[PDB]
Design an enzyme around this catalytic site. Structure first.
Site, PDB file in Angstrom:
ATOM      1  N   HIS A 196     -10.811  -0.985  10.555  1.00  0.00           N
ATOM      2  CA  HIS A 196     -10.880  -0.718   9.126  1.00  0.00           C
ATOM      3  C   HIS A 196     -10.710  -2.013   8.325  1.00  0.00           C
ATOM      4  CE1 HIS A 196      -9.643   2.106   5.616  1.00  0.00           C
ATOM      5  NE2 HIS A 196     -10.915   1.753   5.575  1.00  0.00           N
ATOM      6  N   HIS A 197     -11.722  -2.358   7.515  1.00  0.00           N
ATOM      7  CA  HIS A 197     -11.781  -3.576   6.696  1.00  0.00           C
ATOM      8  C   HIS A 197     -11.919  -4.846   7.529  1.00  0.00           C
ATOM      9  CE1 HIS A 197     -10.748  -0.891   3.496  1.00  0.00           C
ATOM     10  NE2 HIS A 197      -9.505  -0.728   3.912  1.00  0.00           N
TER      11      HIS A 197
ATOM     12  N   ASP B 252       0.829  -1.204   0.000  1.00  0.00           N
ATOM     13  CA  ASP B 252       0.000   0.000   0.000  1.00  0.00           C
ATOM     14  C   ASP B 252       0.871   1.264   0.000  1.00  0.00           C
ATOM     15  OD1 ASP B 252      -1.302  -2.387   1.383  1.00  0.00           O
ATOM     16  OD2 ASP B 252      -3.058  -1.124   1.092  1.00  0.00           O
TER      17      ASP B 252
ATOM     18  N   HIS C 201      -3.953  -9.440  -1.280  1.00  0.00           N
ATOM     19  CA  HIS C 201      -4.072  -8.072  -0.808  1.00  0.00           C
ATOM     20  C   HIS C 201      -4.854  -7.968   0.497  1.00  0.00           C
ATOM     21  CE1 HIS C 201      -3.753  -3.849  -0.839  1.00  0.00           C
ATOM     22  NE2 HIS C 201      -5.062  -3.696  -0.819  1.00  0.00           N
TER      23      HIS C 201
ATOM     24  N   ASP D  89      -2.015  -2.301  -3.932  1.00  0.00           N
ATOM     25  CA  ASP D  89      -2.300  -0.875  -3.821  1.00  0.00           C
ATOM     26  C   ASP D  89      -1.025  -0.090  -4.118  1.00  0.00           C
ATOM     27  OD1 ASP D  89      -4.990  -1.356  -3.371  1.00  0.00           O
ATOM     28  OD2 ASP D  89      -5.000  -0.672  -1.300  1.00  0.00           O
TER      29      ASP D  89
ATOM     30  N   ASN E 109      -7.140  -3.429  -4.193  1.00  0.00           N
ATOM     31  CA  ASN E 109      -8.416  -2.858  -4.597  1.00  0.00           C
ATOM     32  C   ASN E 109      -8.238  -1.537  -5.329  1.00  0.00           C
ATOM     33  OD1 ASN E 109      -7.722  -1.794  -1.902  1.00  0.00           O
ATOM     34  ND2 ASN E 109      -9.690  -0.716  -2.043  1.00  0.00           N
ATOM     35  N   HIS E 110      -7.125  -0.832  -5.108  1.00  0.00           N
ATOM     36  CA  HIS E 110      -6.896   0.403  -5.850  1.00  0.00           C
ATOM     37  C   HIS E 110      -6.443   0.157  -7.278  1.00  0.00           C
ATOM     38  CE1 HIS E 110      -7.623   3.601  -2.901  1.00  0.00           C
ATOM     39  NE2 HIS E 110      -7.428   2.620  -2.038  1.00  0.00           N
TER      40      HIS E 110
ATOM     41  N   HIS F 248      -3.648  -3.784   2.537  1.00  0.00           N
ATOM     42  CA  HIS F 248      -5.036  -3.316   2.595  1.00  0.00           C
ATOM     43  C   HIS F 248      -5.313  -2.512   3.863  1.00  0.00           C
ATOM     44  CE1 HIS F 248      -9.053  -3.075   1.053  1.00  0.00           C
ATOM     45  NE2 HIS F 248      -9.609  -3.812   1.999  1.00  0.00           N
TER      46      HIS F 248
ATOM     47  N   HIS G 157      -3.971  -0.210   6.730  1.00  0.00           N
ATOM     48  CA  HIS G 157      -2.815   0.700   6.701  1.00  0.00           C
ATOM     49  C   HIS G 157      -2.166   0.758   8.080  1.00  0.00           C
ATOM     50  CE1 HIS G 157      -4.961   2.613   3.051  1.00  0.00           C
ATOM     51  NE2 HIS G 157      -4.236   1.564   2.706  1.00  0.00           N
TER      52      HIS G 157
ATOM     53  N   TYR H  24      -2.316   4.638  -5.969  1.00  0.00           N
ATOM     54  CA  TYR H  24      -3.490   5.379  -5.473  1.00  0.00           C
ATOM     55  C   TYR H  24      -3.920   6.480  -6.442  1.00  0.00           C
ATOM     56  CZ  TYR H  24      -3.220   2.854  -1.077  1.00  0.00           C
ATOM     57  OH  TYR H  24      -3.167   1.869  -0.129  1.00  0.00           O
TER      58      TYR H  24
HETATM   59  C1  LIG Z   1     -17.623  -0.289   8.539  1.00  0.00           C
HETATM   60  C2  LIG Z   1     -17.296   1.160   8.151  1.00  0.00           C
HETATM   61  C3  LIG Z   1     -17.580   1.427   6.671  1.00  0.00           C
HETATM   62  C4  LIG Z   1     -17.232   0.224   5.792  1.00  0.00           C
HETATM   63  C5  LIG Z   1     -15.916   0.450   5.046  1.00  0.00           C
HETATM   64  C6  LIG Z   1     -15.833   1.878   4.486  1.00  0.00           C
HETATM   65  C7  LIG Z   1     -14.487   2.545   4.784  1.00  0.00           C
HETATM   66  C8  LIG Z   1     -13.436   2.163   3.729  1.00  0.00           C
HETATM   67  C9  LIG Z   1     -12.886   3.355   2.931  1.00  0.00           C
HETATM   68  C10 LIG Z   1     -11.522   3.826   3.464  1.00  0.00           C
HETATM   69  O1  LIG Z   1     -11.499   4.556   4.405  1.00  0.00           O
HETATM   70  N1  LIG Z   1     -10.219   3.441   2.922  1.00  0.00           N
HETATM   71  C11 LIG Z   1      -9.738   2.616   1.820  1.00  0.00           C
HETATM   72  C12 LIG Z   1     -10.535   2.652   0.516  1.00  0.00           C
HETATM   73  C13 LIG Z   1     -10.199   3.578  -0.460  1.00  0.00           C
HETATM   74  C14 LIG Z   1     -10.908   3.642  -1.655  1.00  0.00           C
HETATM   75  C15 LIG Z   1     -11.957   2.762  -1.887  1.00  0.00           C
HETATM   76  C16 LIG Z   1     -12.294   1.813  -0.906  1.00  0.00           C
HETATM   77  C17 LIG Z   1     -13.354   0.917  -1.124  1.00  0.00           C
HETATM   78  C18 LIG Z   1     -13.687  -0.018  -0.154  1.00  0.00           C
HETATM   79  C19 LIG Z   1     -12.980  -0.076   1.035  1.00  0.00           C
HETATM   80  C20 LIG Z   1     -11.927   0.798   1.229  1.00  0.00           C
HETATM   81  C21 LIG Z   1     -11.589   1.756   0.272  1.00  0.00           C
HETATM   82  P1  LIG Z   1      -8.234   3.654   1.590  1.00  0.00           P
HETATM   83  O2  LIG Z   1      -8.665   5.059   1.248  1.00  0.00           O
HETATM   84  O3  LIG Z   1      -7.577   3.682   2.943  1.00  0.00           O
HETATM   85  O4  LIG Z   1      -7.340   3.106   0.512  1.00  0.00           O
HETATM   86 FE   LIG Z   2      -4.287   0.523   0.684  1.00  0.00          FE
HETATM   87 ZN   LIG Z   3      -6.390  -2.041  -0.214  1.00  0.00          ZN
END
Ligand SMILES: CCCCCCCCCC(=O)N[C@@H](c1cccc2ccccc12)P(=O)(O)O
Ligand SMILES: [Fe+3]
Ligand SMILES: [Zn+2]
Ligand SMILES: *[C@@H]1O[C@H](CO)[C@@H](O[C@@H]2O[C@H](CO)[C@@H](O[C@@H]3O[C@H](CO[C@H]4O[C@H](CO)[C@@H](O)[C@H](O)[C@@H]4O)[C@@H](O)[C@H](O)[C@@H]3O[C@H]3O[C@H](CO)[C@@H](O)[C@H](O)[C@@H]3O)[C@H](O)[C@H]2NC(C)=O)[C@H](O[C@@H]2O[C@@H](C)[C@@H](O)[C@@H](O)[C@@H]2O)[C@H]1NC(C)=O
Ligand SMILES: *[C@@H]1O[C@H](CO)[C@@H](O[C@@H]2O[C@H](CO)[C@@H](O[C@@H]3O[C@H](CO[C@H]4O[C@H](CO)[C@@H](O)[C@H](O)[C@@H]4O)[C@@H](O)[C@H](O[C@H]4O[C@H](CO)[C@@H](O)[C@H](O)[C@@H]4O)[C@@H]3O)[C@H](O)[C@H]2NC(C)=O)[C@H](O[C@@H]2O[C@@H](C)[C@@H](O)[C@@H](O)[C@@H]2O)[C@H]1NC(C)=O
Ligand SMILES: *[C@@H]1O[C@H](CO)[C@@H](O[C@@H]2O[C@H](CO)[C@@H](O[C@@H]3O[C@H](CO)[C@@H](O)[C@H](O)[C@@H]3O)[C@H](O)[C@H]2NC(C)=O)[C@H](O[C@@H]2O[C@@H](C)[C@@H](O)[C@@H](O)[C@@H]2O)[C@H]1NC(C)=O
Ligand SMILES: *[C@@H]1O[C@H](CO)[C@@H](O[C@@H]2O[C@H](CO)[C@@H](O[C@@H]3O[C@H](CO)[C@@H](O)[C@H](O)[C@@H]3O)[C@H](O)[C@H]2NC(C)=O)[C@H](O[C@@H]2O[C@@H](C)[C@@H](O)[C@@H](O)[C@@H]2O)[C@H]1NC(C)=O
Ligand SMILES: *[C@@H]1O[C@H](CO)[C@@H](O[C@@H]2O[C@H](CO)[C@@H](O[C@@H]3O[C@H](CO)[C@@H](O)[C@H](O)[C@@H]3O)[C@H](O)[C@H]2NC(C)=O)[C@H](O[C@@H]2O[C@@H](C)[C@@H](O)[C@@H](O)[C@@H]2O)[C@H]1NC(C)=O
Ligand SMILES: *[C@@H]1O[C@H](CO)[C@@H](O[C@@H]2O[C@H](CO)[C@@H](O[C@@H]3O[C@H](CO)[C@@H](O)[C@H](O)[C@@H]3O)[C@H](O)[C@H]2NC(C)=O)[C@H](O)[C@H]1NC(C)=O
Ligand SMILES: *[C@@H]1O[C@H](CO)[C@@H](O[C@@H]2O[C@H](CO)[C@@H](O)[C@H](O)[C@H]2NC(C)=O)[C@H](O)[C@H]1NC(C)=O
Ligand SMILES: CCCCCCCCCC(=O)N[C@H](c1cccc2ccccc12)P(=O)(O)O
Ligand SMILES: CC(=O)N[C@@H]1[C@@H](O)[C@H](O)[C@@H](CO)O[C@H]1O
Ligand SMILES: CC(=O)N[C@@H]1[C@@H](O)[C@H](O)[C@@H](CO)O[C@H]1O
Ligand SMILES: *[C@@H]1O[C@H](CO)[C@@H](O)[C@H](O)[C@H]1NC(C)=O
Ligand SMILES: [Cl-]
Ligand SMILES: [Cl-]
Ligand SMILES: [Cl-]
Ligand SMILES: [Fe+3]
Ligand SMILES: [Zn+2]
Lengths: 425, 428
Positions: free
Chosen positions: B291-292, B131, B282, B160, B197-198, B319, B321, B163
């Site tokens: 988170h996740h 990442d 990932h 990742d 996922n990115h 995934h 961080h 970004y």
């Molecule tokens: C239970 C609370 C809400 C459910 C999960 C939502 C929070 C995840 C989003 C985020 O805060 N972060 C990652 C991220 C980036 C871009 C798209 C994503 C799609 C699904 C996942 C992560 C993505 P990140 O920005 O750290 O790469």
């Molecule tokens: Fe990431």
């Molecule tokens: Zn990721």
């Protein structure tokens, strides 16, 4: 052991006439029921992709134009596959259509559904894992002789079972198309992709998943803004029907995952009160065969089905019948021990209906005793009927191939989870 | 949302190599199953140019030419430059090679060192980076990796990358900058790519519906060498390690291509040739951060029992961080109604390491499930990177280095005891 119908069976007869259309099948071609995809094959030469059609009410003949395609699979070469969408159809109207306009014409008919609405009654047939055995033929016979009169088949996957043959002998797709025509040429079947459609065969350099199925069976996936034929939605009468792909990706961020999360947000239970999900692999299943194969998709989507008050989930894959209680298993957090399904009146009923015949084998081995999440199960060949009466009531019934065509061996009233959420256990 | 911590476009790490049509964003990865080949990749911006690579070892020095392929893509209103991928084969083991790209106009020279032949007691040092992104934190992690006294020889990259998809219309210029930024490492040692996922970049709202398109044009992998039908899952052998790369955002249902590939691939592993069995994915199967949380559950139902059956040594993921190291546990006994859903100590299981803390866009994941579960050995929300240092068939040393520490300080470390050759409790 080979219970598949021989090639010279009457149900596989070639319709006569030079380049006569064969394997004629129809399915809904739009989001709301005003269109129809007409599909068929010609064997002697490409022919015309034109469809001539008219309503009984107006009797004006019109022509629609479509597209021809071919494919190869190992050493098999297909005939000429036609797909043509007829559009702007009037609701609740009988139409005739003709294919093969250049040489040997054949005529068929269908009745469009009524416009979508709260209380619009509609009778859905449920068929899964059909195949082309003698058992398959009996199930189809029972469906078309049913006094309930099914108007559209929801088909939960595993169509021809051609992939059990040497090099997947795709001749067995052609025979299946000829055999099912007596139903699907006159009413739509709504297609779900099952594991026998994958046909992933790297050893004969056939590496594109779902290839023969995707060429032969088109679905209106762009109409619900899906980017793939393997997941999509249609509305019909009082139902919103979501078709999912057990054998595509559904991780967070994938096309199918993204599409479904947004599609659930678009459902309007004030226009289509019955929310129906189709998938091949069952999330709840107490049979030995394929036990727990559905856990992966369950972890992803079960909680959404509860949140959006899905009425019922239909699946196949297991060659038997099962009807769950309304149950959920969405409270597990790795270390909290909460992994037992509980009764949950906000959850859908899960029905396994993969017992239409396949290649002649029933799944009889069950986990004992019947778990609390399972309401009724039986290892018999048959089919289902989901008969919507209005926004609050739908009647589901299961008919066995060994019973009379009018005999229901299981039956239960569904109370709508959005409009009438009273305990229907 | 979030303060913009990405390095600006005029940053020194984003400088364009000078000269007409000078190759940029140069990167290499292993090009075959066993280490005798290298995929050489780079971009030319002014015109197509040549895909030829001139290469030679420092010993003899006979100069040879390999011919590759050029490709381009569009993404919304972005048009790529000209992308070259070229595979040099039949290299000698444990040998320094010089290679040159840009042969028509402005040549640039780099070098790499082939790994030793695969073998039971072959030592090798892998870096672990997840990442990464292109924030100032990203640049510090790479600096710490480059400056490590342990000397990483190949990076295992758990997904990742750039970004870029956080920018408007995924502004793909941020793929080019990331390529220029990482060149100072990946032009000289292979990075082993995992799709995160990115990399999906599924954007139907601007008519970009082809998963992984920018990533898959820019980063190639030798997937056919392990008889995979897709670039998103594959395996390689290098020194004493057998590395399996999986795709969290591809299909893995029973009967799917990836599922079928992995089941056959595990049967090909021979721990008397490559004792260290390593999996990259990932999304982590074990993760005690909020988170996740539990996103890995689906893949875990399909694959965790296989990992225990084949005694995988370690599973690396990103995934999340942050950093986390599990105990050796398994949670494969569940049968719906038997109530067995708690992970238990299992000396046949791998250790699961989350190492997705290299910087991303400057944000750490600090909210953790409480209390720390029994299955979690160590966790901390700090930026850093890992090192997996194989000594021999029984011992490998893993260390975690934090950006806020000196480049030689390990805030966490643990000796791995090989699950095939030395299955001793290596806990704590
Ligand atoms: C239970 C609370 C809400 C459910 C999960 C939502 C929070 C995840 C989003 C985020 O805060 N972060 C990652 C991220 C980036 C871009 C798209 C994503 C799609 C699904 C996942 C992560 C993505 P990140 O920005 O750290 O790469
Ligand atoms: Fe990431
Ligand atoms: Zn990721
Ligand atoms: C696509 O590829 C398929 C796979 O190759 C093709 O199917 C194969 O077609 C070959 C013909 O070239 C078949 O081989 C022959 O089989 C003859 C059958 O004789 C048998 O009949 C009695 C009936 O009582 C059996 O009991 C007994 O087994 C007897 O042998 C046989 O006489 C021939 O000798 C011939 O080769 C056989 O001999 C080989 C020599 O050692 C043996 O190694 C081997 O066992 C051969 O069978 C073959 O059986 C068939 N395979 C399969 C899996 O079906 C297919 O061909 C098309 O379909 C077949 C069924 C035939 O009708 C053929 O004419 C037709 O082209 C290919 N399809 C296309 C469109 O190209
Ligand atoms: C949405 O659809 C559902 C499913 O169809 C509807 O529920 C059905 O509603 C009908 C009425 O429209 C019910 O049928 C009626 O049942 C009574 C009671 O039957 C029982 O008792 C009799 C003695 O009282 C006994 O003889 C009989 O054998 C049975 O055991 C019948 O008496 C009645 O028949 C008489 O009335 C009709 C109407 O004039 C005459 O034509 C007959 O000749 C008789 O004189 C009739 O058959 C049916 O039972 C309901 N089904 C279920 C599964 O509940 C639902 O209707 C709504 O909900 C039900 C529960 C009632 O409250 C209805 O009044 C109400 O409208 C539909 N919803 C809407 C909004 O329409
Ligand atoms: C399949 O259907 C096509 C189109 O209907 C047939 O082609 C057409 O065949 C007609 C024969 O009945 C041709 O018309 C005839 O021409 C004579 C004098 O030339 C006139 O008295 C009068 O116009 C007749 O209708 C017509 O030209 C032809 N159209 C084409 C070729 O575009 C086709 O017939 C078969 O192929 C053609 C090439 C001829 O050889 C026919 O004899 C033959 O039957 C139909 N195919 C089959 C196998 O039935
Ligand atoms: C980038 O690199 C290309 C290829 O090396 C340059 O184009 C090439 O320039 C050659 C002259 O230096 C051309 O020479 C040809 O071959 C013989 C000698 O081998 C000549 O005697 C003969 O007259 C031929 O013209 C060669 O044709 C040409 N190749 C192409 C265009 O494919 C390119 O140079 C730039 O374009 C050429 C056309 C000249 O005008 C140069 O002055 C100009 O710089 C290089 N570009 C840059 C910016 O360095
Ligand atoms: C595989 O690699 C590991 C890690 O390097 C080896 O274990 C290490 O063996 C060293 C011996 O060469 C040990 O170093 C000595 O430690 C003593 C203190 O007791 C010092 O006084 C002395 O000067 C040395 O520095 C080192 O401590 C040890 N490390 C660990 C973490 O155990 C391993 O060696 C084999 O296993 C170990 C456990 C001993 O039995 C060794 O004698 C034995 O060779 C290497 N294994 C193989 C098969 O090569
Ligand atoms: C990212 O991190 C790297 C490594 O820590 C930083 O590299 C440093 O920047 C340049 C090379 O890119 C070097 O500049 C040197 O300093 C003077 C200015 O004081 C300059 O005028 C000289 O010509 C000389 O090149 C510097 O030594 C180098 N440090 C290293 C390699 O250790 C880079 O600045 C960072 N970039 C960002 C945007 O954070
Ligand atoms: C499949 O089922 C159909 C319907 O039961 C069978 O249809 C019969 O076909 C024969 C001759 O083809 C007719 O004489 C009968 O009148 C039909 N029966 C009915 C009830 O319509 C068909 O034979 C079956 N085919 C196979 C191979 O089992
Ligand atoms: C015993 C040999 C005689 C004929 C065998 C052909 C049977 C194939 C179709 C079937 O009967 N069953 C499939 C099936 C069974 C068992 C394990 C499976 C694993 C992965 C996917 C499907 C599996 P199906 O997809 O239809 O359930
Ligand atoms: C659709 C597809 O990839 N088909 C492959 C072809 O590409 C490849 O060149 C060869 C393999 O032997 O034949 C087959
Ligand atoms: C241009 C447009 O409106 N839609 C395009 C479509 O034409 C194209 O086929 C698809 C991928 O090829 O991407 C989108
Ligand atoms: C491209 O953008 C949007 C997709 O949501 C749509 O309005 C437009 O019709 C698309 N073009 C297509 C699908 O050709
Ligand atoms: Cl025609
Ligand atoms: Cl996921
Ligand atoms: Cl599955
Ligand atoms: Fe089946
Ligand atoms: Zn199935």
């Amino acid at each position: 052991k080979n219970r598949d119908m021989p090639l010279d069976s009457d149900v596989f007869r070639v319709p006569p006439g030079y380049n006569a259309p064969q394997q004629v099948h129809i399915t809904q071609g739009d989001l709301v029921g005003r269109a129809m995809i007409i599909s068929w094959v010609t064997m002697d030469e490409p022919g015309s992709s034109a469809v001539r059609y008219w309503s009984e009410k107006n009797g004006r003949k019109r022509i629609a134009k479509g597209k021809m395609s071919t494919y190869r699979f190992f050493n098999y070469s297909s005939g000429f596959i036609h797909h043509t969408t007829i559009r702007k159809l009037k609701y609740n109207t009988k139409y005739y259509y003709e294919v093969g306009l250049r040489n040997t014409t054949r005529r068929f008919s269908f009745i469009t559904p009524p416009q979508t609405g709260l209380d619009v009654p509609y009778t859905f047939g449920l068929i899964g894992d059909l195949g082309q055995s003698f058992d398959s033929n009996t199930t189809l016979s029972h469906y078309e002789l049913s006094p309930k009169k099914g108007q559209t088949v929801l088909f939960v996957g595993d169509l021809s079972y051609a992939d059990r043959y040497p090099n997947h002998d795709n001749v067995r797709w052609d025979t299946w198309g000829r055999f099912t025509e007596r139903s699907v040429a006159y009413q739509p079947w709504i297609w779900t992709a099952g594991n026998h459609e994958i046909e992933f065969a790297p050893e004969i350099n056939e590496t594109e998943p779902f290839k023969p199925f995707s060429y032969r069976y088109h679905v209106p996936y762009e109409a619900s803004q899906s980017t793939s034929p393997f997941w999509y939605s249609i509305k019909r009468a009082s139902a919103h029907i979501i078709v999912l792909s057990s054998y595509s990706a559904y991780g967070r961020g994938t096309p199918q995952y993204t599409w479904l999360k947004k599609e659930l947000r678009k459902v309007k239970r004030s226009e289509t009160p019955w929310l129906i999900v189709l998938m091949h692999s069952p999330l709840y299943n107490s049979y030995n065969h394929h036990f727990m194969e559905g856990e992966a998709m369950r972890t992803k989507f079960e909680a959404w089905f509860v949140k959006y008050k899905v009425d019922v989930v239909f699946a196949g894959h297991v060659h038997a019948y099962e009807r769950s209680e309304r149950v959920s298993n969405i409270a597990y957090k790795i270390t909290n021990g909460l992994c037992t399904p509980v009764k949950d009146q906000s959850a859908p009923v899960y029905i396994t209906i993969g017992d239409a015949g396949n290649y002649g084998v029933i799944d009889s081995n069950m986990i004992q005793p019947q778990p609390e999440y399972s309401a009724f199960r039986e290892a018999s060949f048959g089919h289902g009927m989901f008969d919507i009466k209005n926004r609050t009531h739908a009647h589901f019934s299961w008919n066995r191939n060994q019973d009379g065509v009018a005999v229901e061996a299981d039956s239960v009233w569904f109370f709508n989870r959005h409009w009438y959420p009273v305990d229907d256990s």
